[PDB]
Swiss-Prot record, chain A:
Protein name, as recorded: Eukaryotic translation elongation factor 1 epsilon-1
The keyword Chloroplast is assigned to this record: no
Keywords per UniProt: Acetylation, Coiled coil, Cytoplasm, Nucleus, Protein biosynthesis
Gene responsible for this protein: EEF1E1
Function: Positive modulator of ATM response to DNA damage.
From Swiss-Prot, chain B:
A biological process from GO: methionyl-tRNA aminoacylation
Record flagged with keyword DNA-binding: no
Span within the parent record: 1 to 203 of 900
Annotated source species: Homo sapiens (Human)
Effect of residue 5 to M: Found in a patient with spastic paraplegia; uncertain significance
Job of this protein: Catalyzes the specific attachment of an amino acid to its cognate tRNA in a 2 step reaction: the amino acid (AA) is first activated by ATP to form AA-AMP and then transferred to the acceptor end of the tRNA. Plays a role in the synthesis of ribosomal RNA in the nucleolus.
Stretches of the chain forming a coiled coil according to its record: none
Compartment(s) of residence: Cytoplasm, Cytosol; Nucleus, Nucleolus
Name of this protein: Methionine--tRNA ligase, cytoplasmic
A GO-annotated cellular component: membrane
Disorder: Interstitial lung and liver disease: An autosomal recessive, life-threatening disorder characterized by respiratory insufficiency and progressive liver disease with onset in infancy or early childhood. Clinical features include failure to thrive, hypotonia, intermittent lactic acidosis, aminoaciduria, hypothyroidism, interstitial lung disease, pulmonary alveolar proteinosis, anemia, and liver canalicular cholestasis, steatosis, and iron deposition. Charcot-Marie-Tooth disease, axonal, type 2U: An axonal form of Charcot-Marie-Tooth disease, a disorder of the peripheral nervous system, characterized by progressive weakness and atrophy, initially of the peroneal muscles and later of the distal muscles of the arms. Charcot-Marie-Tooth disease is classified in two main groups on the basis of electrophysiologic properties and histopathology: primary peripheral demyelinating neuropathies (designated CMT1 when they are dominantly inherited) and primary peripheral axonal neuropathies (CMT2).
Annotated keywords: Aminoacyl-tRNA synthetase, ATP-binding, Charcot-Marie-Tooth disease, Cytoplasm, Disease variant, Hereditary spastic paraplegia, Ligase, Neurodegeneration, Neuropathy, Nucleotide-binding, Nucleus, Phosphoprotein, Protein biosynthesis, RNA-binding, tRNA-binding
Family affiliation: Belongs to the class-I aminoacyl-tRNA synthetase family.
Subunit structure: Monomer. Part of a multisubunit complex that groups tRNA ligases for Arg (RARS1), Asp (DARS1), Gln (QARS1), Ile (IARS1), Leu (LARS1), Lys (KARS1), Met (MARS1) the bifunctional ligase for Glu and Pro (EPRS1) and the auxiliary subunits AIMP1/p43, AIMP2/p38 and EEF1E1/p18. Forms a linear complex that contains MARS1, EEF1E1, EPRS1 and AIMP2 that is at the core of the multisubunit complex.
Length: 170, 203
């Protein structure tokens, strides 16, 4: 299964360069993360908390800088929690990879030329699948490999996660 | 821009109700397609609603389409709204899917339908009661309201499936449903069939 949300949020804090603290509790059968913010409301949900952390880090630009970019970040965060963490990756990961591969053919990052929170979370969420891909599968999903490679080399993102080997065949 | 919708697909409700927020920023033409038409070049399986942006990028998420329309109208993102939207996607949607599948495909009624969503409806009602504000994330109808209204509408539009004791939820739902863009969206998606319009989509 996927990274527990408290583990993923701890990893995200380190990637963002947060110092810090923040304790998370968990609620319900699915162990949904809950943050009690100092002198603020409680926040619930992985991507809700993630967007909050980006703001804590004074890195609001990671949420997008235009209406279009902001909506696209949120679209890809939803894809992360509903498709990658949901049934579709469990039942048919290859259709998900085929679609991402087609999508990323002409894009550096998920929203285009700007790196965002969506790249970070899709990277974290896909790591368990990509780390297990064969040589040939990484060549088949060339555009996913290239994007994943960019993210694993992006400053501060990888943290403790295993580096994946990519070999260009060009 | 070009917004792709299809008859009886429930995700078309919120997007049609929110499309007016783009007025004076960009144009939203409505294209009505079959439920099996694949409009997004990078997606293998058909998805509706879909927005083809002026840039030629696509939004294929109902909540993101609605978010985009609100952002065009000058809405500022807030944490509480994100919280509702994430809950809607991961918690309410599964529960609502089952409830509507029972009602529509299996012909179940009363608590055999409502059972699947009662806890979730109680949560919305309780949240509305505990806040003093008439809407989900504040004082005026906003993004969280349209997304949640849009998900619930196919069920709650029949008064028999809108539980009487949930008075906060009732009043909120009434206030939303009476707004002209909501009425039009309801008429467009469900037409004369009410919840039964969903049957091909639900399965």
């Amino acid at each position: 299964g996927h990274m527990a949300a408290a583990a993923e949020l701890s990893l995200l804090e380190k990637s963002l360069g947060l110092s810090k603290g923040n304790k998370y509790s968990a609620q319900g059968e699915r162990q949904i993360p809950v943050l009690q913010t100092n002198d603020g409301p409680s926040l619930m949900g992985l991507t809700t908390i993630a967007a909050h952390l980006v703001k804590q880090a004074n890195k609001e630009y990671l949420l997008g800088s235009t209406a279009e970019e902001k909506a696209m970040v949120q679209q890809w965060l939803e894809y992360r929690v509903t498709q990658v963490d949901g049934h579709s990756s469990k039942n048919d990961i290859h259709t998900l990879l085929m679609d991402l591969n087609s999508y990323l053919e002409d894009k550096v990052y998920l929203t285009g030329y700007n790196f965002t929170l969506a790249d970070i979370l899709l990277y974290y969420g896909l790591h368990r699948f990509i780390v297990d891909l064969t040589v040939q599968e990484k060549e088949k999903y060339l555009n996913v490999s290239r994007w994943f490679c960019h993210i694993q080399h992006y400053p501060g993102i990888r943290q403790h996660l295993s580096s994946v080997v990519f070999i260009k065949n060009r | 821009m070009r917004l792709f919708v299809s008859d009886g697909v429930p995700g078309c409700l919120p997007v049609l109700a929110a499309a007016g927020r783009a007025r004076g920023r960009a144009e939203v033409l409505i294209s009505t397609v079959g439920p099996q038409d694949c409009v997004v070049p990078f997606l293998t399986r058909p998805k509706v609603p879909v927005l083809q942006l002026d840039s030629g990028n696509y939004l294929f998420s109902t909540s993101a389409i609605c978010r985009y329309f609100f952002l065009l109208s000058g809405w500022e993102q807030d944490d509480l709204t994100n919280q509702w939207l994430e809950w809607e996607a991961t918690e309410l949607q599964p529960a609502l899917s089952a409830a509507l599948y029972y009602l529509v495909v299996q012909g179940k009624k009363g608590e055999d339908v409502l059972g699947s969503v009662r806890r979730a409806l109680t949560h919305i009602d309780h949240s509305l009661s505990r806040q003093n504000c008439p809407f989900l994330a504040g004082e005026t109808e906003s993004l969280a309201d349209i997304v949640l209204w849009g998900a619930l509408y196919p069920l709650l539009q029949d008064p028999a499936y809108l539980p009487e004791e949930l008075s906060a939820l009732h009043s909120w739902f009434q206030t939303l449903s009476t707004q002209e863009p909501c009425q039009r969206a309801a008429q467009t998606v469900l037409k004369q069939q009410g919840v039964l319009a969903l049957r091909p989509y639900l399965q």
